[PDB]
């Protein structure tokens, strides 16, 4: 529904019918995400990884008791055409969830 | 408690019950971690699929940005109806209720603007595939988060029983 | 003296009597009477009295009381898990077992020695109450196997009739029992 | 209480014990002998070849392990439900129920040792072949396969 | 058992006691002296200025408080895990680990009082200045800030 | 013997004395002195001395003491919860009361007999320390309601002023107390 | 009776004996036939016996024994995570530690009392086996740090050589030990 990323790909998201929103800074993306969650949690929120590594961490206090507005990070267009550490992201997620490093 | 033989027998029974409960909770944690190991591989595969869809969608988008002017795609995005009413059903996972996003339709692909150049049209479908993979990734990540919370709770309870009571 | 059954007189009389009715202090504190600890009580005259029960109460009375005792044993077994994790973490079948055990305790085992009617119950009245409870349990189990959630069952109207059956007088009981059985059949048959 | 002086000294002098269970008694099973806390110290010297049958010890210990596992699964299914259980857990659950129904609850019957071994093999047949880690392949080939509808405790 | 009549009655007569720990011994620590149960009642007569060093008593008090904090943090970690710790709690936990590794464990070294005080100040350096409520501000800065471990 | 308060001598003494000062081994292990267990101790003269406290110490001394005791009881009650799940899993008010309980038990109850100044404490000094602690508690509650985080409050520099209050001499104490009160009332206003 | 170590006989015995060899039924249940638990056992003669060991066995025998004990302790410290997630999910270094502990348990501590050769063993054979195991551990750790996969290391026939060592006759052991040390040197980095 709602996407936070660079303004260039926000045009494509709007072209898809999604509520693409433009941002270019970590603090600016944090402010935009706070604005989105404050004005209603109905929209699903795709945040860009470079702008925000852990989207739920930034608005963790405001997201207390919130279930519908799920937040996840996305790589972005500049990083899309480059090698993506899918193993690193999964290892970090497993470490956060279970408190261990078990990737072997 | 009052020191008496009956109280002593009651305490010994309580100790036996605590040990049996510890064993049962450890078995439950074993089942949970098996499910977690399955979900980790599922999430990794979904993330790889999303990455591939992202690559192809961005390649499609950038191609139309140079062959056609940005004003054309801007007008097309202004003319397309927005997306609304994405299904948000709930799912039961080990008792706790987890949301499950379900993109029923990207408005059904029912409306398009009057100006539809060849390069622009393919870009929108790429973004639709992008979104329908992103929803799957989000659902899987929510499932792993719930299972991880359950595992952490069980481990905390087991530690409390083994080291306090 | 201290409530300790390890006291020598209690042990000496424990090896001689043919029936033992241990009293629970927890039930007495809760004002749940007769306050008899079902786990710690027993009787050695069960088998010898079976022909009399068959001839004078009903042909299947021993089977009914055995089923009730097995239900109580299963509830006692599940109470350990209930204390470990809480009553909400159980499945639907175990929740039903717990609820049926609670109903048995509150509506069949409990008895008011001061009430005009409840102070004395004949064998046939107890047999009818047991039959009602067992029929309700079978219906509820069948309903749960059909996907009906445990919360709807606990709200069924027939529970008030089951709870109130103990206060019906002896000569009013035969018709009330048949009405309760038909209502129990109808409530589950019509709903699902 | 097994720390009382009388049972304590009796165990300290004698070899093993047979433990009755109140749970089995209240569940309608007779004789209510619980196999898990029971133990015979001289059992290994009285069974084998030329004494009972050559597969006695392995059948006994396989029954012990399978019954313990079934009891554990029965405890677990109360909280996690039967969906989370694998196929093997369901097999162990069915085995435990059948074991309590047929092997222990024999009533007033006088069973020969061969009849008891036959019922034990019929009960073990419910488990998948290859789960019987404590039984050699020769005995499995010779005895595994029969069903409860030929030989069982309610004929 | 510290409640047994022999040690219990001995404690009522003597000035303090040196108590050994089985956990420290099993962790390969010598001498395995557990500082929390240990006590010395005549210590304040012998330490001060004009004897040993002036900061002796305050350093001992700060060490006791910090080690107690580390022990309770260790107890908390065994339930919830390390990853949930606050930065201050992690600092106290690693202080307790370093204390057990370097201060208690000697081997057969004949460490003098100045060396022991130097090691103690190095250990207290791991904590943030301002958490040392037991120590007067004068001794802090004069002795605070030593390198983590010269060993 | 063994710290057992069920000793015949202790039980026979407790039937006639008007106060009971119970020493705890756990407090002495942590070098918390005088190591008086404030949960197991009591006194029967506290209600009869209130007029003297009002006439000689302060008009609202009993209310301040009761508030301190209530806060200490609340943190003692929350201790068992916090030791199982961790402070971070609690609400902001609970974390604040835990922190103020730590401040109370490390800056008010503790007293050093071998210190040159802290050895003796008059009633006015204790009253001032209690006033400072309670004023800080009220201001922290107001700030937390305004939305300030717990850690930002914890890292305030006036907590150090409160912590060193008991080492201040009797002569200089009133000025230190007034300045600390001004700092307490001015710190949170700037923090907003 | 009951296997409790708090019996007065056991406490009196442990205050005067020099060594305690704790047997376990659990170890015997796992076919670890010597069935002596190394976590609960201890001995007070090693320090006084070191001078004899340094002359009759080898010059560095105490160091090898201490290293083996440390490796066993490190194995015991990792038994929680291997129970949680399983051995296949560990890192390379921890998996190597677990494997080396398994090698020790199955090849050095374990002993067959009914075998015609393994029933007895001299001090020199034990020293040789410890030396071989430690050398293999060092080589494997270096290879792991280089970038070799752990599963590849598990396929080396040097493990098969080491496992058979305890069945080698006492007369022929030194030649086997020399050949096995040469093979350990010639594995790993000698063939990448």
From Swiss-Prot, chain A:
GO biological process terms held by the UniProt record: proton motive force-driven plasma membrane ATP synthesis
Amino-acid biosynthesis keyword on record: no
Pfam family of the protein (one): ATP-synt_F
Record's keyword terms, sorted: ATP synthesis, Hydrogen ion transport, Ion transport, Transport
Gene Ontology MF: a single term: proton-transporting ATP synthase activity, rotational mechanism
Job of this protein: Produces ATP from ADP in the presence of a proton gradient across the membrane.
UniProt record similarity statement: Belongs to the V-ATPase F subunit family.
Name of the featured protein: V-type ATP synthase subunit F
Gene: atpF
From Swiss-Prot, chain B:
GO biological process assignments: proton motive force-driven plasma membrane ATP synthesis
Origin superkingdom: Bacteria
Gene Ontology MF terms in the entry: ATP binding; proton-transporting ATP synthase activity, rotational mechanism; proton-transporting ATPase activity, rotational mechanism
Keyword line: ATP synthesis, Hydrogen ion transport, Ion transport, Transport
Biological role stated in the UniProt entry: Produces ATP from ADP in the presence of a proton gradient across the membrane.
Stated family: Belongs to the V-ATPase D subunit family.
Name used for this protein in its record: V-type ATP synthase subunit D
Curated annotation (Swiss-Prot), chains C, F, G:
Family to which this protein belongs: Belongs to the ATPase alpha/beta chains family.
Function comment: Produces ATP from ADP in the presence of a proton gradient across the membrane. The V-type alpha chain is a catalytic subunit.
Protein's name according to its UniProt entry: V-type ATP synthase alpha chain
Part of the full-length chain shown: 387 to 578 of 578
From Swiss-Prot, chain E:
Protein name, per record: V-type ATP synthase beta chain
UniProt function note: Produces ATP from ADP in the presence of a proton gradient across the membrane. The V-type beta chain is a regulatory subunit.
Highest taxon in the source lineage: Bacteria
Recorded family membership: Belongs to the ATPase alpha/beta chains family.
